[PDB]
Short mmCIF file of C-alpha atoms and ligand atoms in Angstrom, two decimals:
data_model
loop_
_atom_site.label_atom_id
_atom_site.label_comp_id
_atom_site.label_asym_id
_atom_site.label_seq_id
_atom_site.Cartn_x
_atom_site.Cartn_y
_atom_site.Cartn_z
CA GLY X 46 0.00 0.00 0.00
CA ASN X 47 0.86 3.69 0.31
CA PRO X 48 4.07 4.54 2.19
CA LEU X 49 4.10 5.57 5.82
CA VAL X 50 6.98 7.87 6.78
CA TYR X 51 8.00 9.71 9.93
CA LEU X 52 9.60 12.94 11.12
CA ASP X 53 11.02 13.16 14.68
CA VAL X 54 11.06 16.84 15.65
CA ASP X 55 12.95 18.80 18.33
CA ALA X 56 12.23 22.35 19.52
CA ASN X 57 15.28 24.07 21.01
CA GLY X 58 17.09 20.76 21.17
CA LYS X 59 14.50 18.74 23.09
CA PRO X 60 12.14 16.25 21.45
CA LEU X 61 8.49 17.03 20.75
CA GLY X 62 7.70 13.56 19.36
CA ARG X 63 6.92 12.01 16.00
CA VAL X 64 4.79 13.03 13.03
CA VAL X 65 3.67 10.07 10.89
CA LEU X 66 2.56 10.82 7.31
CA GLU X 67 0.74 8.66 4.76
CA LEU X 68 1.93 9.45 1.23
CA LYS X 69 -0.74 9.12 -1.51
CA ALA X 70 1.42 7.29 -4.01
CA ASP X 71 -1.70 5.92 -5.73
CA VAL X 72 -2.72 9.47 -6.64
CA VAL X 73 0.66 11.27 -6.94
CA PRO X 74 3.33 8.56 -7.25
CA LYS X 75 6.16 10.86 -8.39
CA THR X 76 5.55 13.42 -5.64
CA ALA X 77 5.13 10.72 -2.98
CA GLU X 78 8.34 8.95 -4.08
CA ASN X 79 10.39 12.15 -3.85
CA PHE X 80 9.23 12.79 -0.27
CA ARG X 81 9.68 9.12 0.73
CA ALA X 82 13.28 9.01 -0.52
CA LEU X 83 14.11 12.39 1.11
CA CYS X 84 12.88 10.92 4.43
CA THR X 85 15.04 7.79 4.15
CA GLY X 86 18.03 9.77 2.86
CA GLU X 87 18.76 6.90 0.44
CA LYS X 88 19.98 9.18 -2.39
CA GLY X 89 22.64 10.68 -0.07
CA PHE X 90 20.68 13.79 0.95
CA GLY X 91 17.31 14.62 2.46
CA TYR X 92 15.44 15.98 5.44
CA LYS X 93 17.52 14.62 8.34
CA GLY X 94 18.92 17.54 10.37
CA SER X 95 16.92 20.22 8.56
CA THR X 96 14.37 22.67 9.96
CA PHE X 97 10.82 24.01 9.91
CA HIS X 98 11.89 27.50 8.81
CA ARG X 99 8.48 29.14 8.25
CA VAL X 100 5.55 28.53 10.61
CA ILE X 101 2.36 30.65 10.67
CA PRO X 102 -0.24 29.97 13.39
CA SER X 103 -3.69 29.13 12.05
CA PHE X 104 -2.18 28.39 8.62
CA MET X 105 0.66 25.86 8.22
CA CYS X 106 4.11 24.64 9.18
CA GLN X 107 6.71 24.67 6.36
CA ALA X 108 9.96 22.72 6.09
CA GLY X 109 12.14 20.87 3.60
CA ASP X 110 14.81 23.43 2.64
CA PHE X 111 17.72 21.17 3.53
CA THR X 112 20.22 23.14 1.44
CA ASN X 113 19.72 26.81 2.49
CA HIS X 114 17.44 26.40 5.55
CA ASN X 115 15.48 29.55 4.65
CA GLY X 116 12.93 28.90 1.90
CA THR X 117 15.21 29.58 -1.06
CA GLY X 118 16.67 26.08 -1.48
CA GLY X 119 16.00 22.37 -1.53
CA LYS X 120 16.21 19.87 -4.38
CA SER X 121 14.24 16.82 -5.47
CA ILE X 122 15.51 13.32 -6.10
CA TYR X 123 14.92 13.95 -9.84
CA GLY X 124 16.80 17.25 -10.21
CA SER X 125 16.41 20.71 -8.76
CA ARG X 126 12.71 21.07 -9.57
CA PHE X 127 9.93 18.90 -10.99
CA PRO X 128 6.44 19.39 -12.45
CA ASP X 129 3.12 19.69 -10.68
CA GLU X 130 1.89 16.09 -10.91
CA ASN X 131 -1.84 16.83 -10.48
CA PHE X 132 -4.16 18.82 -8.22
CA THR X 133 -6.55 15.95 -7.50
CA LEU X 134 -6.24 15.96 -3.69
CA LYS X 135 -7.50 19.12 -1.98
CA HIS X 136 -6.42 21.17 1.04
CA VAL X 137 -9.35 19.88 3.06
CA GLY X 138 -8.32 20.65 6.66
CA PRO X 139 -5.69 20.27 9.35
CA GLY X 140 -3.08 17.58 8.69
CA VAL X 141 -2.88 17.96 4.90
CA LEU X 142 0.67 17.50 3.53
CA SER X 143 1.35 19.59 0.42
CA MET X 144 4.27 20.81 -1.71
CA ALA X 145 5.53 24.35 -1.22
CA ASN X 146 6.47 26.08 -4.47
CA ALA X 147 7.38 29.37 -6.14
CA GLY X 148 4.91 29.11 -9.02
CA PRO X 149 3.86 26.39 -11.47
CA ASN X 150 6.19 23.40 -11.80
CA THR X 151 8.68 24.43 -9.12
CA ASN X 152 8.41 21.51 -6.67
CA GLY X 153 11.72 20.65 -5.04
CA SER X 154 11.83 19.43 -1.46
CA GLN X 155 9.92 22.08 0.52
CA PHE X 156 6.58 21.02 1.96
CA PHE X 157 4.02 22.15 4.47
CA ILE X 158 1.57 20.62 6.91
CA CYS X 159 -1.68 22.57 7.15
CA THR X 160 -3.28 23.41 10.51
CA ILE X 161 -6.57 24.59 8.91
CA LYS X 162 -8.45 24.15 5.61
CA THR X 163 -6.54 26.20 3.00
CA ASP X 164 -8.84 26.06 -0.02
CA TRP X 165 -7.16 28.89 -1.92
CA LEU X 166 -4.12 26.62 -2.43
CA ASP X 167 -6.21 24.07 -4.35
CA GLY X 168 -5.02 23.93 -7.96
CA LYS X 169 -1.75 25.69 -7.02
CA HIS X 170 0.01 23.28 -4.61
CA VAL X 171 0.20 19.51 -5.03
CA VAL X 172 -1.32 17.73 -2.03
CA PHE X 173 0.36 14.36 -1.53
CA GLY X 174 -0.46 13.01 1.92
CA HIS X 175 -1.73 13.63 5.42
CA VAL X 176 -0.88 13.24 9.09
CA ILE X 177 -1.72 9.76 10.46
CA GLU X 178 -0.35 10.36 13.95
CA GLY X 179 1.25 13.32 15.71
CA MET X 180 -1.08 16.25 15.19
CA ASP X 181 -0.16 17.13 18.79
CA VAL X 182 3.42 17.57 17.62
CA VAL X 183 2.24 19.67 14.65
CA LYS X 184 0.25 21.91 17.05
CA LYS X 185 3.38 22.36 19.18
CA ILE X 186 5.38 23.37 16.09
CA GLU X 187 2.56 25.73 15.05
CA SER X 188 2.64 27.37 18.50
CA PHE X 189 6.28 28.39 17.89
CA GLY X 190 5.45 30.29 14.71
CA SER X 191 4.40 33.91 14.15
CA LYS X 192 2.47 36.03 11.66
CA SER X 193 5.69 36.70 9.72
CA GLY X 194 6.55 33.00 9.67
CA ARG X 195 9.63 33.45 11.88
CA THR X 196 9.92 30.71 14.46
CA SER X 197 10.49 31.52 18.14
CA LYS X 198 12.21 28.16 18.79
CA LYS X 199 14.58 26.27 16.52
CA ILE X 200 12.50 23.43 15.05
CA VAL X 201 14.66 20.56 13.76
CA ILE X 202 13.83 17.24 12.06
CA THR X 203 16.38 15.19 13.98
CA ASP X 204 15.46 11.85 12.39
CA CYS X 205 13.18 10.72 9.60
CA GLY X 206 12.51 7.61 7.57
CA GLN X 207 10.06 5.03 6.31
CA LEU X 208 7.82 2.82 8.47
CA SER X 209 6.16 0.79 5.66
CL1 CL Y 405 11.84 4.00 15.10
#
């Protein structure tokens, strides 16, 4: 079936717990595979040790820039950027996992976990999974964000990988 992956997250160097994500490889196989491989690190790079650099309460928590740690970087397993696969899945509510981007066909490695329904992103960002377990951890991360997106604690993915 669809992959299950995990992110273990610290805030200011102490663990918050684990976020478990189901990746909708049946719907968006290419997008799911990129994220899966970046969690395992099997290509020699990926999310381990990187940060949630942009977190906005009552919106979303954004991560995945493992090259520049600031929203300008990241790369996919395919190359620097890859196409929007489809917009079939929608930003239905809290726990949606979706690709950050800088316009059409600019997916790399950055992603976000929604903490509310974000319908205006439908048709613009590729949704590719959702939180199975660990919304409590997501709410903790969210609580360390701000209107500007600047975090008030350093939020680090210490470990990540594939469960099934
Ligand atoms: Cl484990």
